[PDB]
């Protein structure tokens, strides 16, 4: 499921379902690794760094990466070129993030 509220405690029993395993949200390095996996399929103009957008927190879910990549790729289709520049990721960040953001650097 996604919701762990509407479940009878008679279901989550020893012998029935022993383990309780969540899929939490990623962090800064897992998003780097996810980006390294997903961006291997596009052609990727190789002096565009994506780690500097992982510097923007937090709040990326795993389903959002491929949609960001689709926004970038179809924008490059509108560019009529197979080449993945940084402005594609600019429009992708500005479109698929999806309030809120400022972000921060106060009080650390």
């Amino acid at each position: 499921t996604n919701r762990a509220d509407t479940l009878d405690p008679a279901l989550l029993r020893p012998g029935r379902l022993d383990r309780k395993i969540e899929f939490p949200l990623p962090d800064r390095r897992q998003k780097r690794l996810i980006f390294s996996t997903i961006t291997s399929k596009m052609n990727l103009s190789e002096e565009v760094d994506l780690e500097d957008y992982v510097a923007r927190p937090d709040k990326i879910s795993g389903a959002d990466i491929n949609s960001i990549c689709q926004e970038s790729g179809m924008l490059a289709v509108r560019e009529n070129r197979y080449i993945v520049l940084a402005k594609d990721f600019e429009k992708a960040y500005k479109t698929v993030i999806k309030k809120d953001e400022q972000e921060h650097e106060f009080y650390k």
């Binding site: 390095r29 897992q30 690794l33 291997s40």
Partner: protein, 380 residues
């Protein structure tokens, strides 16, 4: 004092550039009270700068493990923990430098006594990845898989303060290459290693091209092997091993097995660096299977003299003891006839009618035996 700290590096650099073995070894034995004098913080820098750059001068086997033993002596004399572990790593590297059978692993069994309790998690795989090398060196495949898995679950806590990602990616490609199942992802790992090998790691990038293009020949796309030796950075990092890659690439591009054999044996001294020559003789083999298939169908079109050992290419004084070896060892029901032409392969696999009945009678005789007890007992 501190002005002599740089002077140790200066004279040791002279002894490494132009000086010789016993002089710098005498300097390593000479600066042993000097470390007792100077502050123990930069002592590890002194140990590294002397030991590593002495062992990277020249193979002199009467001194390498002997000075490693001296470092063992002093590390178990002054008895500090943080310094001796680099000596441990260097010694097990030196043991791997002749592919030692057990004592490298016996030392790794001491490395597991220290590192897995402490905090420096990269220093663990700094020797565990070497153990992942040596379990390929003895071909312990699942334990090398476990060591690679330990490396992967290790390296997601550490940013990149030394270069360690590319070495891990390369040997990940090595373990994915001992499988010989998946090659495109392994090629991606070698390519990522190569991305981590740009202009700072030439003794590894000299064979990174070897590994990636041996993989792409193993991927059997010689068009892209030609197009990526036409790649700009491979032409930046060219040599004679790229001549090996290009010649074997053309040899598999056109399947001239004579070209394969000739250009293969031309560069044997660089062919040693791929101990998987089973790839090469299996391109020979795994081509020769369908070669004998296309040369086993023409046997009923017009076969020529000596139907079994003059039909093939017949190159360089009896190219057989391979075909006959694959009727001996292996099989396709290819029985020999010296006087047919077709070397007739015919058979009838389903004869299970007699098989399953024989398997029944085997157990039915046992059932008769196990009824004989009742028989001989109920009368008298």
């Amino acid at each position: 004092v501190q002005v002599k700290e740089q002077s140790i590096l200066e004279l040791g650099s002279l002894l490494a550039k132009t000086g010789q073995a016993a002089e710098l070894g005498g300097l390593l034995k000479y600066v042993r009270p000097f470390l007792n004098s100077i502050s123990k913080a930069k002592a590890a820098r002194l140990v590294r700068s002397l030991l590593d750059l002495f062992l990277d001068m020249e193979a002199a086997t009467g001194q390498e493990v002997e000075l490693c033993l001296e470092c063992i002596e002093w590390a178990k004399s002054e008895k500090r923990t943080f310094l001796r572990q680099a000596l441990e790593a260097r010694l097990v590297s030196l043991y791997f430098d002749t592919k030692r059978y057990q004592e490298a692993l016996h030392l790794g069994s001491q490395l597991l006594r220290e590192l897995k309790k402490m905090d420096d998690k990269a220093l663990l795989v700094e020797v565990q990845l070497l153990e992942s090398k040596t379990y390929h060196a003895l071909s312990n495949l699942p334990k090398a898989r476990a060591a690679l898995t330990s490396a992967r679950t290790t390296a997601n806590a550490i940013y990149c303060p030394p270069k360690l990602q590319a070495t891990l990616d390369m040997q990940s490609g090595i373990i994915h290459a001992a499988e010989e199942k998946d090659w495109k992802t392994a090629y991606s790992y070698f390519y990522e290693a190569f991305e981590g090998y740009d202009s700072i790691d030439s003794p590894k990038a000299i064979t990174s091209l070897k590994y990636m293009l041996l993989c792409k020949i193993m991927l059997n796309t010689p068009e892209d092997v030609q197009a990526l030796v036409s790649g700009k950075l491979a032409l930046r990092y060219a040599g004679r091993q790229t001549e090996a890659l290009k010649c074997v690439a053309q040899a598999s591009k056109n399947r001239s097995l004579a070209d394969f054999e000739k250009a293969l044996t031309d560069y044997r001294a660089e062919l040693r660096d791929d101990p998987i020559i089973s790839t090469h003789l299996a391109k020979l083999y795994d081509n020769l299977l369908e070669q004998n298939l296309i040369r086993v169908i023409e046997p009923f079109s017009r076969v020529q003299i000596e139907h079994i050992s003059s039909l093939i290419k017949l190159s360089k004084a009896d190219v057989e003891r391979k075909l006959s070896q694959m009727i001996l060892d292996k099989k396709f029901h290819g029985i020999l006839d010296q006087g047919e032409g077709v070397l007739i392969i015919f058979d009838e696999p389903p004869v299970d009618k007699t098989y399953e009945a024989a398997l029944e009678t085997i157990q039915n005789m046992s059932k008769v035996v196990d009824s004989l007890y009742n028989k001989a007992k109920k009368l008298t």
